[PDB]
Design an enzyme around this catalytic site. Sequence first.
Site, PDB file in Angstrom:
ATOM      1  N   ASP B  68       0.895  -1.213   0.000  1.00 51.09           N
ATOM      2  CA  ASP B  68       0.000   0.000   0.000  1.00 51.09           C
ATOM      3  C   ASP B  68       0.864   1.171   0.000  1.00 51.09           C
ATOM      4  O   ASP B  68       1.484   1.379   0.907  1.00 51.09           O
ATOM      5  CB  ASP B  68      -0.928   0.065   1.216  1.00 51.09           C
ATOM      6  CG  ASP B  68      -1.861   1.268   1.186  1.00 51.09           C
ATOM      7  OD1 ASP B  68      -1.690   2.107   0.334  1.00 51.09           O
ATOM      8  OD2 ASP B  68      -2.736   1.335   2.016  1.00 51.09           O
ATOM      9  N   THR B 102      -0.238   4.824  -5.556  1.00 48.82           N
ATOM     10  CA  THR B 102       0.967   4.772  -6.376  1.00 48.82           C
ATOM     11  C   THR B 102       0.854   5.694  -7.583  1.00 48.82           C
ATOM     12  O   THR B 102       1.832   6.348  -7.962  1.00 48.82           O
ATOM     13  CB  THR B 102       1.253   3.335  -6.850  1.00 48.82           C
ATOM     14  OG1 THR B 102       1.424   2.480  -5.713  1.00 48.82           O
ATOM     15  CG2 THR B 102       2.512   3.296  -7.703  1.00 48.82           C
ATOM     16  N   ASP B 399      -8.927  -1.257   0.879  1.00 46.99           N
ATOM     17  CA  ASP B 399      -9.026  -0.762  -0.489  1.00 46.99           C
ATOM     18  C   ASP B 399     -10.258  -1.316  -1.190  1.00 46.99           C
ATOM     19  O   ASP B 399     -10.971  -0.570  -1.871  1.00 46.99           O
ATOM     20  CB  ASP B 399      -7.771  -1.132  -1.285  1.00 46.99           C
ATOM     21  CG  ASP B 399      -6.550  -0.321  -0.876  1.00 46.99           C
ATOM     22  OD1 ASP B 399      -6.705   0.612  -0.124  1.00 46.99           O
ATOM     23  OD2 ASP B 399      -5.472  -0.642  -1.318  1.00 46.99           O
TER      24      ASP B 399
END
Lengths: 526, 535, 537
Positions: B68, B102, B399
């Site tokens: 993560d 990301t 998530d």
Amino acid sequence: HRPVLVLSQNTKRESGRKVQSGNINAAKTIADIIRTCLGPKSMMKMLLDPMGGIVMTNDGNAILREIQVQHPAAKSMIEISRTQDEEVGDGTTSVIILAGEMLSVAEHFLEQQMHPTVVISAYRKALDDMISTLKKISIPVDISDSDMMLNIINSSITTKAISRWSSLACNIALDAVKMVQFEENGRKEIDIKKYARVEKIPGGIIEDSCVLRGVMINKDVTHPRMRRYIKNPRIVLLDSSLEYKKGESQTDIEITREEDFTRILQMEEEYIQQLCEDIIQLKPDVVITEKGISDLAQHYLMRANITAIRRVRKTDNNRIARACGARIVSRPEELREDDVGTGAGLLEIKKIGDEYFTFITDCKDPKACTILLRGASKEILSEVERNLQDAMQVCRNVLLDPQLVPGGGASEMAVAHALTEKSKAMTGVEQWPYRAVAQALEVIPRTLIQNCGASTIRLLTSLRAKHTQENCETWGVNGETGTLVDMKELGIWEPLAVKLQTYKTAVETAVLLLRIDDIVSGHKKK
Amino acid sequence: TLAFDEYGRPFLIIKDQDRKSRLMGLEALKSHIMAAKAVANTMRTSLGPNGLDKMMVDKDGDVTVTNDGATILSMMDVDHQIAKLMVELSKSQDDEIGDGTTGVVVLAGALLEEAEQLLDRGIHPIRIADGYEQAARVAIEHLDKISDSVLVDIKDTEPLIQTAKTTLGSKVVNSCHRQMAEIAVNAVLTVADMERRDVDFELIKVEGKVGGRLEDTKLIKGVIVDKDFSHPQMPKKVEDAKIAILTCPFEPPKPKTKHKLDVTSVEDYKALQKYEKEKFEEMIQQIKETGANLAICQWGFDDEANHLLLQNNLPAVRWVGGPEIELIAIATGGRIVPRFSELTAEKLGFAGLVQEISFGTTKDKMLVIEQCKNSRAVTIFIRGGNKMIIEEAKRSLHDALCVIRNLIRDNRVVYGGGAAEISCALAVSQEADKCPTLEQYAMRAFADALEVIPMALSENSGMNPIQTMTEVRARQVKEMNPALGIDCLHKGTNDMKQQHVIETLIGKKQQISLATQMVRMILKIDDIRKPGESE
Amino acid sequence: GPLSVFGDRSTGETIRSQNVMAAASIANIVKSSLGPVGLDKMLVDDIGDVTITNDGATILKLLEVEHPAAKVLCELADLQDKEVGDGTTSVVIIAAELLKNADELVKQKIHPTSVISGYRLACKEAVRYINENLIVNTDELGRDCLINAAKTSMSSKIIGINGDFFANMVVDAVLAIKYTDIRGQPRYPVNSVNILKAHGRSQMESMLISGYALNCVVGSQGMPKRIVNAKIACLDFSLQKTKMKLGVQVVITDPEKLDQIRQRESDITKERIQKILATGANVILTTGGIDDMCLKYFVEAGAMAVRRVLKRDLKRIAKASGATILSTLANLEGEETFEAAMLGQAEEVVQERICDDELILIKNTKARTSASIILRGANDFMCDEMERSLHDALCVVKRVLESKSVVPGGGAVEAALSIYLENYATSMGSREQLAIAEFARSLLVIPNTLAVNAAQDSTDLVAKLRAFHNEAQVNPERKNLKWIGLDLSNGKPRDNKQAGVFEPTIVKVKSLKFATEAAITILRIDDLIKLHPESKD
């Protein structure tokens, strides 16, 4: 550690009023060291040196030379004392005092929005009138009169600590200078520096001091069989040795035969004989040299009944030649009768405190002399030696410049009034700093009466008033009584040359020191 | 010069000026872009299905291995004022959307990298920043052109499960690729408010216990707390629970103010002993009169109470925490009762089987509730063979829960796999030449930066980025632009419609907008005044 | 990322600002010593040596500088002394201002190459303008321009007297050393004038000697100290006992010859020392030495023999007295010669007492009648400054005699040029009018600095000067106001031609050319790299 980008690392700058008044304050500070070494009532100063010695003096130059200062401006005043010591004799204390006052009056005007070049220019103009005035009040000297000359010297040794024996010192100085009056070629000279030797021997009392009609050296005879007393010697002065030495070469003598070793040594003895035969052809009584004398040379000298002195200094041997009239030669093979010191007097080797001193005295007409000082210790002997140096310089001065000025403050007052009377017609900005010079001149009679304990109001007010008249112009300060007496009765007269230089030095000193506005410190030279 | 003037004096403007540093020029701009390259080089290594994990070692020696980005970037020791902002970028994306931890760093880095040539061409630093806005609007407008969904959040949850699979596919829990996708869908849809499209994050609790395997993770229709029955011989099974939620200790009531009871006579001493005994009996009978058969108390019990609880067959647990009694009361439909004397049957909770679970050799005694009545809260129970996979599983399900919430907020989706990014890059390029007044170089730089994502994905997938990008970009032009992306195993063809690679529209809209704004605020700087050593 | 250079690198406006400061830190030194209203400096080194001066050359030679931009101005001052000999104060002041104004142009985005180009055009025109506004050659003024030029050069020095005492000594000393070379070169080699110092009487008693003063002593106290109608023998070999060379050894197997060999070492010396005196010489000058045996032969002969003098001075005496310097024997394997017929002459050679020291003078010399100056000061600080002041004054008069052209002083040259160039800047004002105008404006630093040091109102006094110089250029009615300068003693304009204020032409034309080159060079050092010394590794 990244440094700051700078120029002239580890240097300092000072500029502006901090320098204009700074340098003057430095001169004021140093000026006071010898304030009390002016008048006839001076006190003695005891100075200690880092070597462990003691100097007891009231000579202004001797005192200042022993003082080490840090301020770069004070160093200038030290240089002033160095110049005066060689140009004049007793022009010492009064120059440092007056020079300080020339800067004091400058400070007053400089702080009143006046450009330094106006102050400097005013002083340069004043010098012309101070010098002109001095020449108008002089009196000619008949230097052939013994009494006038002795009185002139008396006035120069009164300030110093040997004034108690003035009836001795005045005669010592006057005659010692006369003995070194030279005239050989077309030039008259008085030489009190190379041949005016003062020889001090501890012991006895100052009343025993005298001037020798000739010279003396601290040497004994080479050999006890030689005469120690010769009434009328024929003196020969040599510079060469009487020894045999290897030459400055690469000489190599091969010893190959039975006789070669002893034959070489025989020739060495014959060398000494050759010299001995040549130095006796003139029938001398006394041979004085600077270099060694061999034992073999002494053998022949004793047979000739010749007295020999071994190792005399160059400064002594040249003085002997002047006293005895001999010629110094460096080649014994060329000795001639003209070299023999005829006219010389008694040779006698005496003992003073178990130490030998050779006297060459009673010469017909010597051109050199030695002053023989006696006393309890180096304390009084050092005081007398220095004071005689000044007395011979002052005698020499008037002998070359036969003009006197009425002293004791009378000169300074007359000049100050002459400046004032002219200043009335200046009618310009320079009128005021011009008059300031006349005020500075009064420091001399002011300090003369301060050092005597007298009122600074009663004497200077009356003295200034007396110099308003054109009749006397010779009123000064009586340093013994504390009153005002006409110098025509006191008899205090000072050389014109000393008075002319005193003013020239004081003004020019100020010209240099009043121009510095920026002091840079901390740089090194390569 | 400082500390030296033309007059030789020191020159001091600010305190300790000799310990400062200032460099403006173009060097501040190149230093900012260069520092960003160090950041981008880090996150590019964890992008795509083959993304590699990071091991983070905390200041206290604790170690956790995570994928993560929120857990990677938040544990940095970087002392650079602009690099710290790159972390805030990932934070803003994490807070609003929760997916592109990301992506926003890789995209923002590419915009800074491509901008490097623009400064060297002599383009004013601010004109570059403005040029990115003209190109960004084009990509955003086209991003909303291609979008469709058939999700109704009733029963046809197939594309919703697929979205969860797309998100979880990047995590370390693919051994539960299906199992966790279904758990996440069931967890949200059973608590979400369909009326407002709101999901309350407090209605889904995530618990765990070390041991077992990821395949043992379950969704519990109820609450899990630390059970500790005050009486050790109390039966541990309730078949039909009538639950009393009480926030009062089982001890004689005391005043809150200073009391100091005065006792003088023996009759006073002995009389109090009787009255206190009665208080212990009344407080327990007041529970039984309501029909309750299980009490849950925030406070502890007296020794006297434990015996009465036994004799009245009234099980109870002790020292249940604030948020635990709050959730229990809501989950069971009851209310929290202040006092014993305010107890009434109308405030009792209703629940089915109540049991505690023992785990191996330990004494954890965790609650399970089997049945409930119209509960609006669920609990997830995560298992795992080590502490690291469990903590990562917590983030993996987080998530998955977040992207489900995002579809509820906005049900418009796009095709992933790089298809959206390549299509946007092509669209910007087509308009970049309409019109090349001043900004031609800047708009093209934006289009090139958009490709950093399928290129980094190709590298991590083991493909050459030139061989891959040139084929896909050609195929999207020769024919009516299909949802053509890239993948590592190719799965046959790269048709995103058949691979079911689903991403949220509002997710990417935020990634473009937030990355662009972050780049602007760090380009328009030409002076950094950071202090140096203390002395 | 950064360069791997192990030193310190600064670029851009960092060095462009620092070079202005460093240059100013040098101009700030000499600005305060410009004109007769300036004041002197005292320089004290680390060990206590004190130097008094006010000239830009000595000050900048003694003071250490570190910044590479400051060394440029120090070198500029050194060049002025070599090329001209005087004026070494305005070249630093003007050059620094050219940089200051250029800095303002650069910060306005005026390309450095257009600043440099404009500066060169302004300099070239300034040279033309000054050469069209000259006053007169030295034929109409005669000796008046020489006395005035001497006193002008002294106006800022310690010998700045109100009278003509020094001005007469300088002008006559230069004219007395006239040596005409081939093709009409009436040179005045002032470098041949021996200047002596002594701490003695006041400045107005300094001597001007007809002849040469040699810093030497008679030595042995048996020689005459005054010779009248002397023949001078100049030689350069040692009057010593004869020595052998290392390559020759004496090896004796018969000791009987030892005494003869030893005797030879003195026989040669005693014969040669007498055969040079059989020539009739009265004064013998040598740069070597006279040993104990040799002194006897000079004394007994009645000769003056001077030993250990400098070769640089003997050559000057020999040329002035007509002597040939004897170094060895000649006449093609002759026995012994000594060039008896090649003796010099002098009317008198006498040793005098100069401040309780000894100095031998050679009077009139009878061949070239050279000159020497013996200065008197009160102390060493004055004497050193007086020598420096005299040297400058001798150089200025030399330049006036060689370059027969004078220009006005008092700032008149700079004021006139500051107006002419403004008209040039307009006429050719396309892209470089800013650089040309700034060059012209920098010229006014001279009348500005003079007004400030005089404590005058700079903004009024100088502005009035320009009004007079402008009227004679914009109203061509033969106003004849182009030779007006500043009177720093009254704060009013003066006619420099009637006031006697003249300066050489070359001290202005050359200063402009030299300052321009330095001002251009300093403008092309945008970057600086300084490497760490190999000290700490």
